[PDB]
C-alpha cells in the first residue's frame, strides 16, 4: 500500500509545475516513521541542475516554527516566561508602550498594532529600536490577530537576548543540532552555496531572499527536503528527542486563542481533525492573512488536532502539515511560488488518500 505514496503524489503535486511553470519542487511524506522523498526538476533552470536530497529552500514563513520551537526551549529553560514583556530583555523598550505586550502576544500576532511588513524605510538596526520604541498601541493589546512579520520577529530577538546569543546561533548552534538537522541554516555557508537552489519569481527571473529588519526570526530559514521531514518526524513522535527539545515542541502545538475554525498556536495553525478541505483553506484566506481579526478564547478544545503552516519567499513556496493521530505528515518545498489554495488541497487529497 506503501506503494501507493509516489502515485498520489505525483497525481497531486506533479501536475502543479506545469500548471505553474515551476522549475522544481520537492514533496517529502512521512508515515509511520518511514520518509518518503518526491523530487522534481530543476533547483536552476540556467545550470540544468535537478533537484535532490541536498537541495536548500527558502522556508519563507515556515521559518517562524523554529522562532517558536525557540521560544519554547528558552521557556523551558527558564530563560524567558510567556508572561514577559520585551523591555525585561531589550533594556532600550523597558517602560515603553510596546513593554506592555507580552512574549505570547508578540509571538501570536495580538499586539493589537503591527501590521504583516515593517516600513519599507525600515532596514538598519537602529530604525528597528526606533520603530518599536516610538510604537503606540490601536486595538486593544491581546483582543486582535493580525498575522505580522515584526511581531513574532520581535519575539525571536528577545528569545536571543534571554539565550545571550544572536537569533542565527540560536537556531544553528542550539535549536538545529538538537533536532538533529545538518543541512539547515540562517545564512548558508559557502560550502552549501552549490546547493543553494535560485527561486523563481512570477517573471521566471532567478532570485533569492533578501536581507531585511528581523528577517531570520520571520522569514529567514533555509533547509533540505530531509530536514523538513526530521522536523516534521520531531513533531509526531517528539519522544526520541531530548526531553529540551521535546518540551519545546510540545509548546508549540498548545493552541493559545481561536478564530473561528483555525487554533493560533505558536508558530503552527492548528485544527480539529478531520478538517474540511474548507477550513484548511481559509485558514489562509486574505481575510485572515492580511486584516485584523478579533479572537476568541478557545472554547471547543480539540481532541484529535491536526497542523499546518505556509511560507512564501520572493522565488519559492512552503507548506508543512502533519496529523499525530495519523502518524502522518508532509512538506512541499518549491523554487517559484503557487497560490496557498494549491498547495493545501494537493496536501489534503494525498494524506485523506494515505489514512
Ligand atoms: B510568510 O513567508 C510571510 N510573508 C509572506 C509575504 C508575501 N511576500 S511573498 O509572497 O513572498 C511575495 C514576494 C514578492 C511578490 C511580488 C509577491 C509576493 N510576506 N511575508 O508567508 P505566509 O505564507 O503569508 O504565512
Known sequence: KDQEIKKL??????????????????????????????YYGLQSVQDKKAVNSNTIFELGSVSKLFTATAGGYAKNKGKISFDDTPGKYWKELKNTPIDQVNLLQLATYTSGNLALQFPDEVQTDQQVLTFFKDWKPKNPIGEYRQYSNPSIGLFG?????????????????????????????????????????????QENQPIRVNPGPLDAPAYGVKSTLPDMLSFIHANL??????????????????????????????????????????????????????????????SKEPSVKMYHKTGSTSGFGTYVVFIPKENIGLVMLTNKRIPNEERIKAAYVVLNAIK
Open 237 to 298: 513522535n517528539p519522544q526520541k528527542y531530548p526531553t529540551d527539545i521535546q518540551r519545546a515542541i510540545n509548546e508549540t502545538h498548545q493552541g493559545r486563542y481561536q478564530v473561528n475554525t483555525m487554533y493560533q498556536a505558536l508558530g503552527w495553525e492548528e485544527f480539529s481533525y478531520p478538517a474540511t478541505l474548507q477550513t484548511l483553506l481559509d485558514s489562509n484566506s486574505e481575510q485572515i492573512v492580511m486584516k485584523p481579526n478579533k479572537v476568541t478564547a478557545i
Open 9 to 38: 503524489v505525483d497525481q497531486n503535486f506533479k501536475p502543479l509545475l506545469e500548471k505553474y511553470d515551476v522549475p522544481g519542487m520537492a514533496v517529502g511524506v512521512i508515515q509511520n516513521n518511514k520518509k518518503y522523498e518526491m
Open 157 to 201: 530577538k528577545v528569545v536571543a537576548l534571554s539565550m545571550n546569543k544572536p537569533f542565527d546561533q540560536v537556531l544553528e548552534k542550539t535549536i538545529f543540532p538538537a533536532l538533529g538537522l545538518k543541512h539547515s541554516y540562517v545564512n548558508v555557508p559557502k560550502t552549501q552555496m552549490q546547493n543553494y537552489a535560485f527561486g523563481y519569481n
